Amino acid sequence: KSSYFDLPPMEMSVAFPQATPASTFPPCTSDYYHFNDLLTPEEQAIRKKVRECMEKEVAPIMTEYWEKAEFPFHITPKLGAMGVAGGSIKGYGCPGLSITANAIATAEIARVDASCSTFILVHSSLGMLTIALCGSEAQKEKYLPSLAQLNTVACWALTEPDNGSDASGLGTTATKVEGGWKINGQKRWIGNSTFADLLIIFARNTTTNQINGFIVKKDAPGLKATKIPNKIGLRMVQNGDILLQNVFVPDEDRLPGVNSFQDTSKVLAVSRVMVAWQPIGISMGIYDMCHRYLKERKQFGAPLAAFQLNQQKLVQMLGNVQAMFLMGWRLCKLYETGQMTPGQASLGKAWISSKARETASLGRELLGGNGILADFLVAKAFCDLEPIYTYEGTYDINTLVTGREVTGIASFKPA
Amino acid sequence: KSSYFDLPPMEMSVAFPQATPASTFPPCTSDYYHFNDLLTPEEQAIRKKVRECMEKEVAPIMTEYWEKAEFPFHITPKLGAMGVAGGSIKGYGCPGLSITANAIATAEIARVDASCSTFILVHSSLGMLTIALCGSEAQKEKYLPSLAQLNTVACWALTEPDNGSDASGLGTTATKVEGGWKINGQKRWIGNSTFADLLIIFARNTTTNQINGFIVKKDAPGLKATKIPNKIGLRMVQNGDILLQNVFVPDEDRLPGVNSFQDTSKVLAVSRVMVAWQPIGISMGIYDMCHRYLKERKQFGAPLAAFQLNQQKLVQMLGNVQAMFLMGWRLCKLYETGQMTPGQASLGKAWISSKARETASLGRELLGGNGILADFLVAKAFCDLEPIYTYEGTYDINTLVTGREVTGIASFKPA
Amino acid sequence: KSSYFDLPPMEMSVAFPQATPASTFPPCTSDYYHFNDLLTPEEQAIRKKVRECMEKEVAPIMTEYWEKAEFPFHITPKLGAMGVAGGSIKGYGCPGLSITANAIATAEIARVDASCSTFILVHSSLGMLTIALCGSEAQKEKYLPSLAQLNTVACWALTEPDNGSDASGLGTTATKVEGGWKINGQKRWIGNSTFADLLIIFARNTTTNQINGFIVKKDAPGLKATKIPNKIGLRMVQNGDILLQNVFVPDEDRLPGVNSFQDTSKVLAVSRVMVAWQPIGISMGIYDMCHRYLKERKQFGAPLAAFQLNQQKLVQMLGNVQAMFLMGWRLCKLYETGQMTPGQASLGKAWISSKARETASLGRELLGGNGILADFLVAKAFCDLEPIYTYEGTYDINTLVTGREVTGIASFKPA
Amino acid sequence: KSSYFDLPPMEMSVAFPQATPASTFPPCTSDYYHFNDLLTPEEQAIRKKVRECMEKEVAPIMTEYWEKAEFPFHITPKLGAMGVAGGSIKGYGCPGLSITANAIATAEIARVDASCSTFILVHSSLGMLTIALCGSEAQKEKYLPSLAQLNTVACWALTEPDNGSDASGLGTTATKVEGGWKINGQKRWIGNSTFADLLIIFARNTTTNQINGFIVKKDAPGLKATKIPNKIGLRMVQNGDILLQNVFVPDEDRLPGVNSFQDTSKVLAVSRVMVAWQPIGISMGIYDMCHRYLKERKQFGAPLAAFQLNQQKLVQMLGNVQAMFLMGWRLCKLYETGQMTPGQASLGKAWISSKARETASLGRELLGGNGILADFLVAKAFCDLEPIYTYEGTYDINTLVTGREVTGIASFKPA
Ligand SMILES: Cc1cc2nc3c(=O)[nH]c(=O)nc-3n(C[C@H](O)[C@H](O)[C@H](O)COP(=O)(O)OP(=O)(O)OC[C@H]3O[C@@H](n4cnc5c(N)ncnc54)[C@H](O)[C@@H]3O)c2cc1C
Ligand SMILES: Cc1cc2nc3c(=O)[nH]c(=O)nc-3n(C[C@H](O)[C@H](O)[C@H](O)COP(=O)(O)OP(=O)(O)OC[C@H]3O[C@@H](n4cnc5c(N)ncnc54)[C@H](O)[C@@H]3O)c2cc1C
Ligand SMILES: Cc1cc2nc3c(=O)[nH]c(=O)nc-3n(C[C@H](O)[C@H](O)[C@H](O)COP(=O)(O)OP(=O)(O)OC[C@H]3O[C@@H](n4cnc5c(N)ncnc54)[C@H](O)[C@@H]3O)c2cc1C
Ligand SMILES: Cc1cc2nc3c(=O)[nH]c(=O)nc-3n(C[C@H](O)[C@H](O)[C@H](O)COP(=O)(O)OP(=O)(O)OC[C@H]3O[C@@H](n4cnc5c(N)ncnc54)[C@H](O)[C@@H]3O)c2cc1C
């Protein structure tokens, strides 16, 4: 309670004149090993298209929305014009991009805002891909064209409160009834669920006692998806607690390609390739910001980029970025050549996100105080990395997928 | 848009039944090296006292205020009843506690909530202490009785946009006028500055060319303090941008004991010990949460505590924590005996600060998904640590303070 | 072949004039937090006495011996004059030191040479202590006084080719025979064993199927112990493969206090406190050496200590040292007060080990090329830490000992 | 003294029968991202030839030689027959391999023995290359053919006691006299120098004040090279202190293409790509050995590979190896494409080197006790990695080479 307590925050141009905030997004200086050499002409055109659009459309508004933990619904039709949704799905009204074209688009979104990327990743590299790989021809033709336009939104429900890392032992049931299925259970952390038109729900078929997948609809009687508050990262992403009580799904809406967790495993493997590319994008952005910031901000009568400790940290981030990118690039190519094991994807995601965590640490301390401000990207990025390091399998779970594959010995279960 | 988009969040007890959230604070398990042995009877009594008060009064409401970036004003008299504000200042209405007493109280506050400790710390171990050291006996008798009971609040303005790490090159001017002084300049990041009744403004005396100190008042004409938004950590702390335009301050509100920057470094050495104790407590709280969570939460039919990977992470935290306490404790003992150099104070704050960053990182990934949720503390703590790692000297600035002392060569300025 | 190939190496004063080799041992600048304040006047006396002797007697010759992987037998009587061997054993011709005194001398020995410390450690803290804690009055008086003078050397044989980390399941058998026992099996890695007078051999008593302990004598029929070659660290220590072929040990030389692994486990805990002081010692040595080296060595027109990067590495070391020391210190008091658990000793030894590794790594790179020369200590110290990080239980085994204790759930056995 | 003290060590098959030592070299499992996909068929063939030669000829003999710190001269005609010496030099009796061809060759040599690698690299990528890039046709035709056959050995002398990192400022002098030059000064750390036939000595022309390069011959009047003893890594490489007192060098032996430091600095960037590949090779070997050791060695009734903690380490190493290779591979393509900058070569060398250090650290602790024995490779490579992390420019110096380039500000010089 003062004369000034109620007053609107001081404008950034007056509050910190020395540096530019992320509204005017930093230029790409993280690309140090000339990555366009590794990209097809079509892939280069997508990279710059996604980037120009994210910097113009999303960067100026992301700070507000991230702070309020609100989703920028108005940005959806643009993201659908970007032709990103539907990744590498061929036909059914999808763009039919290369896995690498999709991967670099993923990074180019994540570079600017990780929530938008997660939004699309969950919608497209999980939601749509599960329909593409596991759906009927009828389902694909019915559901994908619109999903690709972003006229409808998908989400992907696997995780439960009782079942997170231990996904194959999920407890959401699916009971065969007359004319379809009856779904019962509870799902947790499902991004988009609070407004998704389509909800791919993984439920245990109670006849076969194996895991099946079902396309649930928005507003189905017995369905309730509600917002998870107080997240420190991915604040624009709407993560849902879902309740299903005798939610009905007709025969035609069961995914025929999901007959046990082995198929969910096959989806997650391809999905982990796309998730790997999020930390790559984020790291690229953090460096870009850090690079500009350090050159702009002056202390002790010199740019902050003049000091040894600041340079060592800047180059450490820079090396991490080149390696991560190449790491993610190889992964894509392994997939394309049809020779990719789940262990290779797990390691891709585990390793990359670990080095990204490291990179965000350094990038965060490099901006000093402003490094904790959403305004300057890094804080946002630093916070957004944490759940990414957790989802699509934790670091520990992913390294054990690889460890099992590389050694021949499962090491998940307790003594 | 949905029939359930607007609905309130699911109750945590139904949302995630397995683990209990921070609103019911975890028991102390972090204290593995029986630290009460290093505490005197009245030092123990205070540890107990603040602990209970923080768990009962602050824990149940800290989630929602932190999320909304609001200060919990209703909580301030309860903190004033604890008799911790005023620190080690003898007399003048203050508690006259030992340095070690002040330190674990700083830790036990930070254990539950870092924002609250920061508020107290800038108020008591910066605001009140500069009055207690650099003040006249008059300034002591007038402001200190009210500041100790928390009936009035203090802040401490050194940092500004152009001068943060280079505090010595402070730009804010102080022209001499009859009756007193006019303050012209700008400050930034100042904790409590939006509602502080007293604002200790550091400004350059244009007559002597040196930095001085001025107790400016709330609602002084020309003075505007405005909240800094979009912080990722220390969200309840009201850090401000301060505009000073011809701000009048009479002869009696100037601090007679600060005629040079040298005087501010004298104070900053003592504060850097209290600040060193923030990460200690925060890290204790993190281990405390983690210990209980890993025992409650089951995965693959076992508690999360049963897994090698988790036990290692938890044990690394434990070790870190013991070492951090011992480090801070010796830092108090060096102060108590009048042999503490600034380098010693800096090493402590740097080292402890760093190991906390490491501890929080481990703690955060130990909780999986829920580790990003403020409701479970470790997410709050993980974020709160970043600012703490940065302010009162960055890790780098502090290390080069020690570096200069121990090699005789200053390495702050560039080539 | 060359006209200079066979010529002796260049003298250090000529080959590298700028910096002093370890032969003139550096002054103690690692003690930054004034550690004598935590020691009794007796504890201070020993620290000093043990340093004076290590610097004068061992430093000038330790390089030549560490390179040839040889033990300096002539050094033995000088070590037994220090009054170290025996440790905390009360009576029976032992010095009856405090636990902290025995801990400090270990650090001061390890500070100059780690091999020398490991010699004394295996001898006094493992070998002699086993006779104190599990021996009978008869054999305590028979063997201990000679051991404390170092007129005779002891070793401690637990590890086997098949049982290192899994010591509880050892396979060396001890067959009850008229008038004593017959020992059969192999031991690996036993320090001093190639010249030890007393070999404490742990073997499975074939009547009870539990581990027992036996005092075996040098040159006993069926005993042969050979050096382990090609060691990168602790190269002065004579580690042996012991082959035991029907070795006769009479009823009088069976330790009546060892009746299962629980007794040998009781011993390891007290020993791990002393081992924990070794990396403390070594890290002090590395710092002391680096500090002097960065002031003497000059590059780009200034002392290496002038550079931001070097100063930070040095300060990081300095921070670790102070924390490691306090950690070892607190651990001693825990033991002195009868409140030490095995899990507390395991934490000390795990954490301090890990911190030393970090320190040595930093310390090694700081000296550039000379950082890989035994002459300049760091290289020797750096290598020596590696087996210390492994023996007395690996970092992982010790982590899980603490792990099991704090969680109450064992996590050693596989999935 | 003992009846068994002078006996030879126990043969490994009886000492530790559970695991196979490096003398029988492990199969390649570190190639997890199918690296041959990124190599030309010529490059795959070279990779194959070198690997089979190193495993057959060097692995069975390396342990004894590394421990004695002696060079295996008898291996020279084999290494010569591999067709590596000469690297990418086209013509003049050299094999004219591609850049990646020489890179993978480097790695495969280093994979088995780092000393052998450094031997060839200093001879080929420094000695021979300096003549190719900076020699006259007359001296290229005269010296290279025999050098490519290893019938003569070259070395490359830049460093001196007073100039290591600051190489630009060396004090070795070249005075113009009738018929040629007289070289005066001292050199340190020069590999192959005790037996090298040709010695490329860099010395400051006294007329022009710039660094020049001179082909000095073995046993030249005034030349004395002596072995630097007591190294902990690359123990097989013969590094020298070189003494030059009025060493005469004829006009025809002055490299006419070396006129200032920027000529030698241009060579350093090309050879720095090759050095980068040394860590890549070594890490692969470390992984390869670990993989096999962890499957073979049983403890607690399971392979060491069965335990979470061990799998995590193993997978972290594997992640690193993939990233390092891709990193090294990309660097080669940047050079092949003619677009490499010093900063990029510096970044590669710095980053890859640091990752290899982390890897060696993990691989070392994964083998327990035996991880300190040269017999099981890991120990040797761990140690070998330290000089590699230091030479060809340090981590600090290399990072600052990139820092200067990306930021535009040099930060080598002190305040
Ligand atoms: C932002 C966000 C979005 C998400 N979106 C979706 C979504 O769209 N769809 C969906 O289905 N799910 C989603 N999830 C859930 C996500 O997949 C889970 O957070 C994660 O996969 C499971 O972890 P958990 O939260 O259950 O924690 P837990 O599984 O309890 O793990 C806690 C800790 O224990 C460790 N651990 C667990 N098991 C072992 C083991 N066997 N050995 C060693 N260590 C172990 C883990 O590494 C982790 O550190 C989302 C989560 C987040 C945070
Ligand atoms: C939550 C919060 C609360 C705060 N509260 C207060 C307060 O109450 N009172 C107050 O006065 N201030 C306060 N501050 C400001 C804080 O003290 C400053 O952030 C910090 O001391 C100076 O950093 P800066 O933000 O100016 O960034 P900079 O000073 O520009 O530093 C940016 C980076 O450059 C590095 N760097 C700077 N100088 C050098 C150098 N010479 N050599 C090598 N590296 C260098 C730093 O390590 C840092 O990584 C607060 C800040 C935060 C985030
Ligand atoms: C220099 C030196 C001196 C020694 N002196 C003595 C002596 O005097 N007396 C004596 O009795 N012994 C001695 N030893 C033996 C030493 O105590 C053992 O090396 C150690 O206790 C067991 O290691 P190991 O060599 O058998 O390796 P292993 O037990 O094979 O372990 C290999 C790796 O696997 C990991 N690992 C093992 N078990 C598990 C598990 N359950 N879960 C997860 N990870 C696991 C370990 O952490 C380690 O990294 C000495 C060793 C050295 C190196
Ligand atoms: C096995 C081995 C083989 C070698 N072979 C050869 C050879 O064949 N030919 C040859 O010419 N040389 C050779 N060298 C020398 C090698 O290139 C040098 O050791 C290296 O360039 C660094 O020199 P230095 O050892 O004097 O380190 P120093 O220059 O003494 O540096 C010591 C420390 O100070 C730091 N430092 C130095 N300058 C700065 C700065 N400006 N800013 C921040 N930090 C700084 C460094 O990072 C390092 O940690 C060899 C060295 C080794 C170990």
PDB file of N, CA, C and O in Angstrom, chain A residues 113-135:
ATOM      1  N   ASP A 113       9.400 -20.314 -28.528  1.00  0.00           N
ATOM      2  CA  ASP A 113       8.571 -20.668 -27.387  1.00  0.00           C
ATOM      3  C   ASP A 113       8.354 -22.168 -27.330  1.00  0.00           C
ATOM      4  O   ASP A 113       7.859 -22.767 -28.283  1.00  0.00           O
ATOM      5  N   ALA A 114       8.716 -22.763 -26.200  1.00  0.00           N
ATOM      6  CA  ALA A 114       8.655 -24.214 -26.027  1.00  0.00           C
ATOM      7  C   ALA A 114       7.236 -24.752 -25.811  1.00  0.00           C
ATOM      8  O   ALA A 114       6.954 -25.919 -26.122  1.00  0.00           O
ATOM      9  N   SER A 115       6.360 -23.906 -25.266  1.00  0.00           N
ATOM     10  CA  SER A 115       4.958 -24.268 -25.071  1.00  0.00           C
ATOM     11  C   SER A 115       4.283 -24.525 -26.408  1.00  0.00           C
ATOM     12  O   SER A 115       3.622 -25.547 -26.584  1.00  0.00           O
ATOM     13  N   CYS A 116       4.458 -23.603 -27.355  1.00  0.00           N
ATOM     14  CA  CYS A 116       3.905 -23.766 -28.698  1.00  0.00           C
ATOM     15  C   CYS A 116       4.374 -25.052 -29.335  1.00  0.00           C
ATOM     16  O   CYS A 116       3.605 -25.721 -30.026  1.00  0.00           O
ATOM     17  N   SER A 117       5.647 -25.374 -29.108  1.00  0.00           N
ATOM     18  CA  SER A 117       6.260 -26.560 -29.666  1.00  0.00           C
ATOM     19  C   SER A 117       5.637 -27.796 -29.035  1.00  0.00           C
ATOM     20  O   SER A 117       5.234 -28.713 -29.741  1.00  0.00           O
ATOM     21  N   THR A 118       5.540 -27.803 -27.709  1.00  0.00           N
ATOM     22  CA  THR A 118       4.912 -28.904 -26.998  1.00  0.00           C
ATOM     23  C   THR A 118       3.453 -29.071 -27.436  1.00  0.00           C
ATOM     24  O   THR A 118       3.013 -30.188 -27.715  1.00  0.00           O
ATOM     25  N   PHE A 119       2.725 -27.959 -27.520  1.00  0.00           N
ATOM     26  CA  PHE A 119       1.369 -27.948 -28.068  1.00  0.00           C
ATOM     27  C   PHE A 119       1.298 -28.727 -29.370  1.00  0.00           C
ATOM     28  O   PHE A 119       0.483 -29.633 -29.506  1.00  0.00           O
ATOM     29  N   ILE A 120       2.161 -28.371 -30.316  1.00  0.00           N
ATOM     30  CA  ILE A 120       2.145 -28.992 -31.637  1.00  0.00           C
ATOM     31  C   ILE A 120       2.672 -30.411 -31.590  1.00  0.00           C
ATOM     32  O   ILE A 120       2.120 -31.292 -32.236  1.00  0.00           O
ATOM     33  N   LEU A 121       3.724 -30.634 -30.810  1.00  0.00           N
ATOM     34  CA  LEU A 121       4.337 -31.955 -30.708  1.00  0.00           C
ATOM     35  C   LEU A 121       3.356 -32.988 -30.193  1.00  0.00           C
ATOM     36  O   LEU A 121       3.245 -34.074 -30.754  1.00  0.00           O
ATOM     37  N   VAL A 122       2.640 -32.635 -29.132  1.00  0.00           N
ATOM     38  CA  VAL A 122       1.656 -33.529 -28.535  1.00  0.00           C
ATOM     39  C   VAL A 122       0.466 -33.756 -29.471  1.00  0.00           C
ATOM     40  O   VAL A 122      -0.046 -34.870 -29.580  1.00  0.00           O
ATOM     41  N   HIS A 123       0.053 -32.692 -30.150  1.00  0.00           N
ATOM     42  CA  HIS A 123      -1.022 -32.738 -31.134  1.00  0.00           C
ATOM     43  C   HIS A 123      -0.645 -33.588 -32.351  1.00  0.00           C
ATOM     44  O   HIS A 123      -1.440 -34.405 -32.832  1.00  0.00           O
ATOM     45  N   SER A 124       0.581 -33.397 -32.829  1.00  0.00           N
ATOM     46  CA  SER A 124       0.998 -33.910 -34.127  1.00  0.00           C
ATOM     47  C   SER A 124       1.900 -35.152 -34.074  1.00  0.00           C
ATOM     48  O   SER A 124       1.611 -36.159 -34.725  1.00  0.00           O
ATOM     49  N   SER A 125       2.985 -35.085 -33.306  1.00  0.00           N
ATOM     50  CA  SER A 125       3.945 -36.195 -33.235  1.00  0.00           C
ATOM     51  C   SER A 125       3.530 -37.283 -32.266  1.00  0.00           C
ATOM     52  O   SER A 125       4.217 -38.296 -32.147  1.00  0.00           O
ATOM     53  N   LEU A 126       2.418 -37.063 -31.570  1.00  0.00           N
ATOM     54  CA  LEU A 126       1.803 -38.078 -30.719  1.00  0.00           C
ATOM     55  C   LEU A 126       0.363 -38.330 -31.148  1.00  0.00           C
ATOM     56  O   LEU A 126       0.006 -39.448 -31.523  1.00  0.00           O
ATOM     57  N   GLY A 127      -0.443 -37.271 -31.114  1.00  0.00           N
ATOM     58  CA  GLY A 127      -1.858 -37.336 -31.446  1.00  0.00           C
ATOM     59  C   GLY A 127      -2.164 -37.805 -32.850  1.00  0.00           C
ATOM     60  O   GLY A 127      -2.905 -38.769 -33.037  1.00  0.00           O
ATOM     61  N   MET A 128      -1.603 -37.128 -33.842  1.00  0.00           N
ATOM     62  CA  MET A 128      -1.898 -37.476 -35.226  1.00  0.00           C
ATOM     63  C   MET A 128      -1.144 -38.718 -35.685  1.00  0.00           C
ATOM     64  O   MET A 128      -1.653 -39.504 -36.471  1.00  0.00           O
ATOM     65  N   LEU A 129       0.071 -38.887 -35.187  1.00  0.00           N
ATOM     66  CA  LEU A 129       0.912 -39.994 -35.588  1.00  0.00           C
ATOM     67  C   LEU A 129       0.320 -41.327 -35.146  1.00  0.00           C
ATOM     68  O   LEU A 129       0.455 -42.327 -35.856  1.00  0.00           O
ATOM     69  N   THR A 130      -0.325 -41.337 -33.976  1.00  0.00           N
ATOM     70  CA  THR A 130      -0.957 -42.545 -33.446  1.00  0.00           C
ATOM     71  C   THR A 130      -2.140 -42.947 -34.320  1.00  0.00           C
ATOM     72  O   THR A 130      -2.352 -44.132 -34.559  1.00  0.00           O
ATOM     73  N   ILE A 131      -2.891 -41.966 -34.810  1.00  0.00           N
ATOM     74  CA  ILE A 131      -3.938 -42.231 -35.802  1.00  0.00           C
ATOM     75  C   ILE A 131      -3.335 -42.730 -37.113  1.00  0.00           C
ATOM     76  O   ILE A 131      -3.848 -43.667 -37.704  1.00  0.00           O
ATOM     77  N   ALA A 132      -2.248 -42.107 -37.562  1.00  0.00           N
ATOM     78  CA  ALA A 132      -1.592 -42.500 -38.805  1.00  0.00           C
ATOM     79  C   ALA A 132      -1.030 -43.929 -38.742  1.00  0.00           C
ATOM     80  O   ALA A 132      -1.267 -44.729 -39.650  1.00  0.00           O
ATOM     81  N   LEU A 133      -0.314 -44.260 -37.671  1.00  0.00           N
ATOM     82  CA  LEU A 133       0.279 -45.593 -37.555  1.00  0.00           C
ATOM     83  C   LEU A 133      -0.679 -46.670 -37.038  1.00  0.00           C
ATOM     84  O   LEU A 133      -0.498 -47.849 -37.324  1.00  0.00           O
ATOM     85  N   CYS A 134      -1.692 -46.280 -36.275  1.00  0.00           N
ATOM     86  CA  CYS A 134      -2.528 -47.273 -35.611  1.00  0.00           C
ATOM     87  C   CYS A 134      -3.995 -47.224 -35.993  1.00  0.00           C
ATOM     88  O   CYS A 134      -4.767 -48.088 -35.572  1.00  0.00           O
ATOM     89  N   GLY A 135      -4.381 -46.223 -36.779  1.00  0.00           N
ATOM     90  CA  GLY A 135      -5.780 -46.029 -37.124  1.00  0.00           C
ATOM     91  C   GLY A 135      -6.219 -46.828 -38.324  1.00  0.00           C
ATOM     92  O   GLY A 135      -5.397 -47.370 -39.055  1.00  0.00           O
TER      93      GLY A 135
END
